[PDB]
Structures are given as C-alpha cells and as structure tokens.
Amino acid sequence: EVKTIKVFTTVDNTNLHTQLVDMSMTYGQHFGPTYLDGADVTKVKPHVNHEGKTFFVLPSDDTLRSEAFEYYHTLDESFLGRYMSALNHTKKWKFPQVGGLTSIKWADNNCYLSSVLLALQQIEVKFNAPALQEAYYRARAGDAANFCALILAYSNKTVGELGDVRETMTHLLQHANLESAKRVLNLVCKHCGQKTTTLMGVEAVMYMGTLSYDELKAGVSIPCVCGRDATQYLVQQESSFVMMSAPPAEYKLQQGTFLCANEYTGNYQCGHYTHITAKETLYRIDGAHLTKMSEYKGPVTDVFYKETSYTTTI
Amino acid sequence: EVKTIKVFTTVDNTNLHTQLVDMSMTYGQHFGPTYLDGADVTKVKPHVNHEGKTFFVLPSDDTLRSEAFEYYHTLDESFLGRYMSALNHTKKWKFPQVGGLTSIKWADNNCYLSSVLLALQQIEVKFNAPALQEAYYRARAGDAANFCALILAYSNKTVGELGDVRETMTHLLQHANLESAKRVLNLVCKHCGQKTTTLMGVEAVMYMGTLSYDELKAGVSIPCVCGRDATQYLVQQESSFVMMSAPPAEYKLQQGTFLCANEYTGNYQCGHYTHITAKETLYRIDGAHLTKMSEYKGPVTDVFYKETSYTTTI
C-alpha cells in the first residue's frame, strides 16, 4: 500500500489545491520545483510534519538567471523561490522601534535575526548586491521585511529554525564591500618562529576565539600549524568595525568599551539571543522589550567595536 | 474653542499613540513629516475623514538623499515615507495568477493598477532605477507587493483613490529604458505644409487620440499649431511596443490584431478597469476573475501592440 499525507499547493499564495502526496516520491517528482518556508524541498520526500502546510510551486526559467545575478549576485536557480516563500512569512512580522533602533518581535525563532539587524544599524557598512542594499536602506528606516527574507535566503536557512548570529554574519558579509578592510596578524610560535599573515576582506573584521578586542591587540593563544600552542596579536587593523566572537560564557560588559553585543542563554539545541547596545547607559533589547542597565554580566557570544585604523606600538 | 480629531501616530506600524490634534495646524506642525496611505500630509490640516486612521511619522534625514537617488532615481525627500506607508497597504493585497499572468484582487481601487501590471507582463521593457527593476522582477514571478507600492509612489497617488492607467504609464515609463525607441511623424497641414517630428523616449511609444495602430499608420486627424485641422501619419517606428490611447468608447477587439488592452466602464468620477489579453482566445481578467471571449466589444481605453521596426511604404 501507499502511505500519503494531505498538503496544499499554490502558485500565487492565494488559491490552494488539496493534494494527497505519496511519501515514496519527492515534491519535485510531484509538482516540479517546490519551496516551503524559505527552503528548497524539490529533492525532499514528504514527512509527517508537512501535513496541513502550503507549498509554493515555482517552475524553473533559465532566462531569469542573468537577472537574478544582477540584483542578488547569485547563480542559484532556487534563490527566487526561497526568497519569495520566506518573504511570505517575514512581511507578517512586527518591527517595533526599540531604543531608537529597529528590532523584531518574537516570532519563528527570529531572536538571532533581531541581533543581526540591530548590529547592522550601528556599524558603517554597505552591500554590493543592489537588492540587498536597497532592503538594508529600508530596514534602517523600519521596513525590514524584505531584508530579513534576503538574510534567510543568503544563509540557506529556513523560517522557524534557529541560527547563529556569527554564522549568519559570515554568509552576509561576503556580499558586503569590505574590499579595503585589512588586518595584519603576527603569529609567534616557539618552534617555527614569528609569522605575518595579511588577512583581508570578510576575514579582516571577524575573529573567533575571544570577545575582548584588547585581548587580540595584546596577544591571544592559538594552535600553530605544527601542533604546538602559539600566540598571535594584532599588528595593523584598517576597517570601520571589528566583530569578536567566542562560545557562550560569562562576560562582563562595561560602558564605553564596546559598540554593541549579543548574548545567548541556553544549550546548543535551544537558546534565546538578546542584544545589548551602549547609548547613555547599557540597553538590552529582547525583541520588542527594552531593559536598561549600568552594566551587564551574562553569556555574551559576539561583541562589536568601532574602528578606523590601528597599529601596534613598537 | 478648538475643534479636534482623534487620530493615532506611529513610527513602527506596531506601537500607536492616541492623539487629539487641532484642525488649526497641519500634521507637520504637530509631529513633523507625516504620511498617510502613501501620501505626504505634512502640510495638510486635519479633516473629519482622518478620524481613527493611523499616521506614519518619519523624520527627515539629509544623509539619505544620496542613497534614495541611487536606488529609486529620485530627489524627493518624501519618497521614502510615501513608499513605506503605501507598501504597508499593498503587502496585504492578494495577487492571484489569472490566465498565467499575475493579477490583483479587488482592493482600494486597484483595478487600474491591475491593468498596468498585466500589460507590463506582456511587453518587453526594463527600468533604469535598480529598486524598480528588482520589484518588477519579483512582480513577474508573483510577488508584486513592492512593485505596486513603487508605482503609487512614482505617480504621487494615494492608496484607495482611483487613477488612469494611461496617466500612470506616463509617470512610470519615464524611468524605463526607452533611450533607443524612435518615432517619426509627418504632419500635413494644408496651410503650413508637411512637417517631420522625430519623437524619442517615452513619447515614441505612446499616442493619445486613437486606439487603432493602423489608424496612425494610415493617417489620423490632429489640430495643427496654426488652428486648422491637419493630418499626421507614422513614418518610422522603432521600439519593442506601442501604446494607443483614447477616451472611452465602444471599440471592437479582434483576435490577433493586438497584444492586450484595457477597458473602462463608468463616468469620469467612478469606473472599473478590466484587462483583455490575446492567448488562444480573448481573455478578460477582472481582478481575480477570468472570462473567455471570441471577441470583445466594449469601452476600450488603451491598447498595446508588439513592434520591432516599422517604415511606411513609399
């Protein structure tokens, strides 16, 4: 016998069709290219959680590859379908202005997207893709619906599933214009010797291992390629911002030492991001809710700092 | 005494504030730059219809003029506020796929916007403004929410008020890339003589006075600048399409003679637009509703034709 599921298919997000789909075949073998909640489910077999959900059917068109590359800088023929189906969810989200910044109301595990949006409103940055920059322009004014849908598409993430704000910044900053961002590190191994690495681009602004920007300037531990544990320190930095990242741990945020930060309470499976910014005192933006603080001591994961140009003291 | 109205103000379209505003002053003198339903009401005094409506407050920012010019090709400092407040209405509209084309469900007098959207999906055209072209790209796939909000902003029109599809095409095609569109007319006055006018750009594709494209090729009446009634006929046309327009009157649409058309039933104050296209037979798209026809005889207002290059016979 055949075990089926009841689902709905649509091509306009208005008129639906009842479908009893066979779990023996993929959605692509049923309907063609199919998307659900911002994810491509073309080569995906039906699963019991899909019952009652509506599926977006968008047939492929080779003539649109040139256009999609112009606006979004992508060659993925599924980007359009995932962007539209994710936007069908984000346009219903609420974007309240908290602490003079655009935040996002709690919905579909967007508490990590809220932290990404709040940090981007405080660092000087521009994106190369025209559609991503126009959406970023409207998001800074309050209309962040298209912007979050783009961030979801660029990260190959699904509406509802949790994500890391650090991982998402990696995927997003590849389309930023960090061409003139430069970072010079001096790795000091006690077997191999001293070593200059000139990192540029997305790598010149992001570090993983520590939250303190002064810790990187003075010296932070790191395993050398020979196996031994070495030490590297920042020699020259040249960008508009830096983003320090580290796994969750109790970090103490002082006033005037940083630009903004993100914290994460919970295990690896489930947790809640909240955003901290420095204005006249420390603000904590938990979605649509705001708290005020002289200082914050919690599980910080990412910290942002302002920069123009730095050089170590000889 | 002072006569007031009860209204709501917001800066996020989520959190509202009750306001009792004085009709003696404008909304700008109350709150700053203020928008309502896609219209700038900054220098507008409160009126009894505004009771219960929510107003969008967006303060001015001179640093955004350069950005807004890049994405939208506009120097109007109110374009952003009118675009966002109009988009807050169009995202709730329904865009059903009728006859293989993206139409719009009846709402807020959008029956003229539906006719504009349906014609743009059948003529070969591209827009210069990047944000307008990306929205046009998504509208051709089904997501026309941002596109209609842009058309409303470019036309300085308000959500809910009726409009002409011909007038709206004029405002919209100024941002199209019709740089290589050329039209040559020969005006023949029986007092002044024969006269060549080389029309280019938005004027090379649009004519007002007749619906028949063969009537313009053969000869159509027109008052000369001397007062007498002359006659002009098309000598050379060089574009991807032409749009013939005329006030409402019974026109008989045959199969295979045109690309698509718009009709309008009613007086000058109120009326309903419906769209006719030619596929295997004549389709009539009245919003979310479709009728099929061997031919249509009704009050046609605008007709579109396909073109590549034309030259009159010597």
Ligand SMILES: COc1cc(CNC(=O)C2CC3(C2)CN([C@H](C)c2cccc4ccccc24)C3)ccn1
């Ligand atoms: C079998 O289904 C799953 C489901 C999940 C869902 N979870 C995620 O998507 C993760 C995205 C994070 C949760 C990882 N981020 C925090 C800040 C984090 C980073 C690095 C190390 C950590 C160590 C301990 C706790 C948190 C850490 C947010 C994951 C895996 N399998």
Ligand SMILES: COc1cc(CNC(=O)C2CC3(C2)CN([C@H](C)c2cccc4ccccc24)C3)ccn1
């Ligand atoms: C005092 O408030 C008003 C309200 C309106 C509302 N109406 C409009 O916005 C017009 C946009 C049209 C209605 C004009 N279009 C039709 C096709 C049309 C064009 C040219 C000539 C016509 C002659 C007779 C009937 C229709 C004609 C659509 C107007 C004025 N004052």
Ligand SMILES: [Zn+2]
């Ligand atoms: Zn959440």
Ligand SMILES: [Zn+2]
């Ligand atoms: Zn070593």
Ligand SMILES: [Zn+2]
């Ligand atoms: Zn209507």
Ligand SMILES: [Zn+2]
């Ligand atoms: Zn004359």
